Design an enzyme around this catalytic site. Structure first.
Site, PDB file in Angstrom:
ATOM      1  CD  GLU A 288      -2.951  -1.357   2.130  1.00  0.00           C
ATOM      2  OE1 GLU A 288      -2.829  -0.677   3.162  1.00  0.00           O
ATOM      3  OE2 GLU A 288      -3.942  -2.106   1.888  1.00  0.00           O
ATOM      4  CG  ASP A 361      -8.152  -5.220   4.489  1.00  0.00           C
ATOM      5  OD1 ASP A 361      -7.688  -5.301   5.665  1.00  0.00           O
ATOM      6  OD2 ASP A 361      -8.552  -4.107   4.038  1.00  0.00           O
ATOM      7  CD  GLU A 389     -10.397  -1.036   7.720  1.00  0.00           C
ATOM      8  OE1 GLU A 389      -9.527  -1.781   8.283  1.00  0.00           O
ATOM      9  OE2 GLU A 389     -10.192  -0.490   6.626  1.00  0.00           O
TER      10      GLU A 389
END
Ligand SMILES: O=C(O)[C@H]1O[C@@H](O)[C@H](O)[C@@H](O)[C@@H]1O
Ligand SMILES: O=C(O)[C@H]1O[C@@H](O)[C@H](O)[C@@H](O)[C@@H]1O
Ligand SMILES: [Co+2]
Ligand SMILES: [Co+2]
Ligand SMILES: [Co+2]
Ligand SMILES: [Co+2]
Ligand SMILES: [Co+2]
Ligand SMILES: [Co+2]
Ligand SMILES: [Co+2]
Ligand SMILES: [Co+2]
Lengths: 700, 701
Positions: A288, A361, A389
């Site tokens: 990332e 993820d 999240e």
């Protein structure tokens, strides 16, 4: 009850008969030791026993009295030594303990015995937990030792104090007043984690800031380490791989460059001068946009081993994350396994590969990361997410215990039956000894630490399971509910069940049946299953679902990306055959026609709609359950949870409507008539996905 | 003590003789009324009296007992009405109250009497304050009424909950759970402010987000308004002037366009449907990139009056900010006055011009904004800063009471003697419609609301002075210390003096003698007096000090920018003559030789050095004073304040060294040998100014 105490609520035992029994059994607290750790244990028992038993119980080192709690090791407590526990204590190791009702010189005693002072601390918290959860002390005889070496929490905290994927306030670390101000909250943080046996913390963001390694910040960090040390919690830091360059000391970060190797060695010397028991490093590299060895054309073992060699003389370890995935590969699902499998056995023994539960993820359900069943010559540790999240930030109720248990009890067939994720993590399958579990908790300065009161339950389950990976979500919830709210059985049962279904509700209104990655990008708060056209296709939604007029799902079998071949043959077989693949994972591996008939008798389109509507109904049922508990909960937390559940039901409806209407637009099939039809169209939900208040301070 | 209660600490009175006297005087609590506001007053008195007197005192509507506290208005309390208080009570108006020991039907009573329910609430808080500060109730007979109409707090809060110039945590407003969750803290926030008589709040950033006006957010905001309402606190919002465009409804925001006029009218109707008593708008326009009427070639009266017309049918007001300054004018100091004076008289009667204390930007000392002495036909209100943007964030101790008092008692000579800023604000000088004072408090989710415990004292003084602008910094500190920490005289005296010097210390180690604007840009945490070469010169440091080998200071006299001509003649005269100009303002108006001799006998270079070193010594003395108070303060707040004072001393040394070495590099003069020579050189401090962790979550663009 404002939640600041979390599950360490030392209030008088409500059962009056049971209270009398405890008052008779524990009349005194005998503590001969005086190390910082024993002092912390004594302080916890003094406050704990005084509160729970509703009378002053003061830690003393005096001649033994009848009906005492006696704590120590054979080295610091002659009374414990006099029992000659021998083998019984030997099996406990460096962190275990024994709790036992017994006799010392004719005096009635309950012992908290261990080999080390930290063992005594952990045992002291368990003793309190027995009383907190209304367990009888008569004939008590139990021993426990942790099953994993490194039981750690992770904080994705930026130095400005904004937390990345943080829904519970600013970072706890008040850099502007450190090292001078030793805030009591730092000790309370240590107490919370030590109560679960957590022995490590990574305080800073994996998207790492090189400043944490500066003298200025090491001095600040040392104050935190000092506060955590008596509680047995070692300090760890996320590192930025380009630090030699960021500091202006070296013109490269290549791990094979001797100047780089030396820079890290010198930096480790500096760290250990401030923090002599520093745990080591967490590393997010070549992922990332974060720098790493691949940026210098080197591999992950070359980078990890360079850092590990810097730490080795001081006993430090490297937690090297496996969360890596290049945008030009065919299938992101295959990424970590294809990156790390060729490096199996190339990592130093003080490197541990930190692997997320699944290969994508932290999505509401993912199959197990194939790396866990494939790496046989490399230390591994699990990474779970607690912060919500993907489960609704601070407004959705989503106990994560079921997700953790599901993962830990998953059979991989790596080396016969019993090759569960938990057994692999313990080191018994592949024969490694450096083991662990890390939990991304992301708490903050909110009074209750976690924002949503029920995120505390997820932190709780995580720590319990890091201690014993076979502990069930139900067991952990039962303890947590007793400790946090009430010991009333009429309360415990329905609320436990509400907690247990909450994870599945979160899957159902977002992405059931193996669907995944349908979130608004990059904030992840609401639905956006239409998401396409991002700089990387693997950050979109359509990449994962591949929905069309004829079907949906991602073919990962031999005729597709063949990610199934990354798993042990019994798993590849079971999941590759439509007759045996679990329906809750099916779309991860198969592209199916909308007419495929499911076990329920519904076709796939109908089943998809049923699941999305079921998730909302599950939230509605949680609302009703919670309303029934008003008599058992304090008015403030009652009202808060009631309100949050309303927010959750509204958002779950938005999720359901957005996703069902989106998939309808692609499939061209009607929503069955028995369901409440969404009154607005798909374009309206695409507008709510632009205008819906994203409740988080941090932003992508 | 974690500071969550702030100054409303209802703990048993420690003086046992005094406690017994209170216990004899107040044995019951009599409340006949039952409106939300009266209920809030009753709940406050119940919890407050019960805590302070260490016995259960429950509010009741029963036959009057001997030794009762009786609250109400003549309208809701027949007992109070029976006293026929008449003119004495009526003269106190819509927010005032009377506290008095008296008799009703031969029963001994203390009354909290007012014309309105909010006057009862305010009086109830004053009654509690008398007890909290150990004042005797025997023969009590006092009345009070506020001297300003709009007594408001401002929050520079972004909707993501990050606070701009916020050093005390995230924004209190939990948008994600509103409107559903009515958090207790919202009520505690209303209690804190109502205890000072604060009657309005602007909850969102002046750098305004158009989303606050959306239906989604108005529903959220209405829940907060509902929580605040029983406490007498009206809701206000900062607006973005381009909102009609941002909503996609109009292709312009020109206030003379009928579609724009209509958009705001319709928007006001929507607001008032949710919040029927909405107070109005705060407006930052045509300043620092914020949109405004000048973006459409219109003036700030045309913009303000357009908004004011939208609000007028609903009784709303526009607080139009005067914080405007174009980059191409010769002297920023002149900006606001030159912008607004031509518009004096052109603003509608429901527009109030909100003016910072000084013409620059909340700097540690500024001369008074000339607009206050010039605008004779326009409603005005004061804007003070509480949050320590320029006084050290949450790590420096800097009670702002003295800054506010210094301002409020400044004689302007606008209409001759007696034209103090306070009297101007009250409406006594120019005879105006609407009056007020606004305080930029920027609290957050930190347990103690303000980060540094002592920022609470600044908020406290602000609200006290908004009620009565003649209250001194000393008086407000004495009350606050008693309510927050201790009534011990041995504690109060030295800590009060420490508080009173703390503002001046913050001036001394940063920018004494009329220096200003020497901060790191744009974060404002540390020193950067060398700052030059920014996109706008008026955001630099060198622009203000103009330091050279020969001298320092900015010429604002007739021979320079002549900003002194914006002031009334007696001020222009006093400040323009070197013989009468105050030394603490001198470099604002005069560019002086380094050899100029000051009152102390030192030359200007020597005085500058002395002041910078004095500031550090003042912090060191604050440390010693605080250490002497360990016996009087709880261990947790004691330790916290001690530690923060250490941080402050270290930062004050950095400030001192950075500025003295910088000015030395320009003047080429030695630091006298009596002073401790800085630990390092100027280049090292230019490095600490790049490396020193800026302790704030928000960051500048
Ligand atoms: O694990 C990680 O590194 C990343 O995980 C993802 O889930 C988060 O969106 C991102 O903020 C983290 O940095
Ligand atoms: O008053 C204002 O509008 C501005 O005041 C300055 O002091 C602040 O630096 C800025 O953040 C504010 O927006
Ligand atoms: Co809670
Ligand atoms: Co950030
Ligand atoms: Co339920
Ligand atoms: Co069909
Ligand atoms: Co405080
Ligand atoms: Co922001
Ligand atoms: Co002092
Ligand atoms: Co000289």
């Amino acid at each position: 009850e404002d939640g600041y105490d979390m599950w360490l609520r030392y209030q008088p035992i409500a059962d009056q008969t049971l209270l009398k029994t405890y008052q008779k059994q524990i009349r005194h607290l005998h503590v001969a030791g005086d190390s910082p750790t024993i002092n912390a244990a004594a302080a916890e028992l003094q406050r704990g026993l005084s509160g729970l038993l509703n009378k002053p119980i003061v830690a003393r080192d005096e001649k033994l009295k009848d009906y005492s709690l006696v704590i120590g090791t054979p080295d610091n407590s002659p009374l414990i030594a006099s029992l000659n526990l021998g083998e019984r204590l030997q099996a406990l190791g460096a962190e275990g303990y024994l709790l036992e009702q017994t006799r010392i010189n004719k005096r009635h005693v309950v012992i908290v015995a261990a080999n080390s002072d930290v063992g005594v601390l952990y045992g002291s918290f368990h003793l309190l937990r027995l009383i907190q959860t209304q367990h009888a002390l008569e004939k008590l005889s139990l021993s426990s030792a942790p099953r994993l070496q490194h039981r750690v929490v992770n904080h994705w905290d930026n130095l400005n104090r904004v937390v990345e994927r943080g829904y519970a306030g600013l970072s706890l670390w008040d850099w502007g007043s450190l090292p001078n101000y030793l805030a009591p909250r730092y000790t309370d943080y240590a107490r919370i984690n030590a109560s679960l046996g957590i022995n490590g913390t990574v305080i800073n963001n994996v998207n790492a800031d090189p400043r944490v390694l500066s003298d200025q910040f090491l001095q600040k960090i040392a104050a935190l380490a000092d506060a955590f040390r008596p509680y047995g919690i070692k300090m760890y830091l996320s590192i930025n791989f380009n630090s030699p360059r960021a500091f202006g000391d070296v013109d490269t970060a290549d791990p094979l460059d001797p100047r780089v190797q030396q820079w890290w060695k010198t930096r480790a010397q500096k760290i250990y001068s401030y923090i002599p028991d520093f745990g080591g490093f967490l590393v997010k590299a070549d992922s990332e946009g974060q720098p790493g060895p691949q940026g210098y054309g080197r591999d992950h073992a070359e980078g990890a081993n360079m850092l590990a060699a810097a730490l080795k003389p001081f006993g430090g370890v490297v937690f090297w994350r496996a969360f890596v995935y290049h945008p030009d590969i065919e299938d992101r699902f295959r990424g970590a396994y294809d990156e790390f499998m060729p490096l199996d056995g190339k990592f130093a023994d003080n490197v541990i590969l930190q692997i997320k539960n699944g290969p994508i993820d932290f999505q509401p359900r993912e199959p197990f990361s194939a790396l866990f069943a494939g790496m046989s010559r490399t230390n591994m540790m699990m990474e779970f997410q607690i912060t919500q999240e993907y489960f609704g930030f601070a407004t959705h109720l989503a106990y994560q215990g079921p997700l953790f248990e599901e993962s830990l009890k998953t059979e991989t067939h790596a080396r016969g039956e019993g090759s569960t994720i938990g057994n692999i993590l313990e080191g018994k399958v592949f024969k490694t000894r450096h083991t662990g579990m890390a939990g991304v908790i992301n708490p903050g300065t909110d009074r209750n630490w976690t924002g949503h009161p029920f995120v505390q339950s997820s932190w709780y389950a995580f720590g319990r399971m890091a201690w014993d990976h076979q502990i069930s979500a139900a067991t952990a919830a039962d303890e947590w509910l007793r400790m946090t709210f009430s010991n009333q059985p009429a309360f415990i049962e329905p609320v436990k069940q509400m907690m247990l279904v909450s994870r599945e509700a979160g899957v159902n209104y977002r992405s059931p049946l193996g669907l995944t990655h349908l979130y608004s990008q990059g904030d992840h708060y609401g639905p956006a299953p239409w998401t396409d056209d991002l700089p990387r296709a693997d950050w979109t939604a359509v990449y994962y679902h591949r929905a069309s007029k004829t079907g949906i799902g991602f073919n990962r079998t031999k005729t597709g990306s063949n990610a199934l071949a990354q798993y042990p043959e019994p798993i590849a077989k079971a999941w590759g055959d439509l007759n045996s693949v679990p329906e809750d994972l099916i779309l991860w591996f198969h592209h199916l026609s909308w007419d495929h008939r499911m076990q329920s008798g519904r076709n796939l389109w109908q089943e998809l709609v049923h699941k999305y509507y079921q998730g909302v109904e599950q939230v509605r049922a949680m609302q009703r359950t919670w309303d029934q508990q008003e008599a058992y909960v304090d008015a403030a937390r009652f009202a808060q949870v009631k309100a949050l559940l309303q927010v959750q039901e509204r958002e779950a409806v938005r999720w359901r409507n957005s996703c069902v209407l989106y998939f309808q637009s692609v499939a061209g099939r009607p929503i069955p008539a028995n369901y409440e039809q969404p009154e607005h169209d798909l374009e309206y939900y695409k507008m709510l996905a632009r205008t819906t208040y994203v409740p988080e301070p941090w932003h992508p």
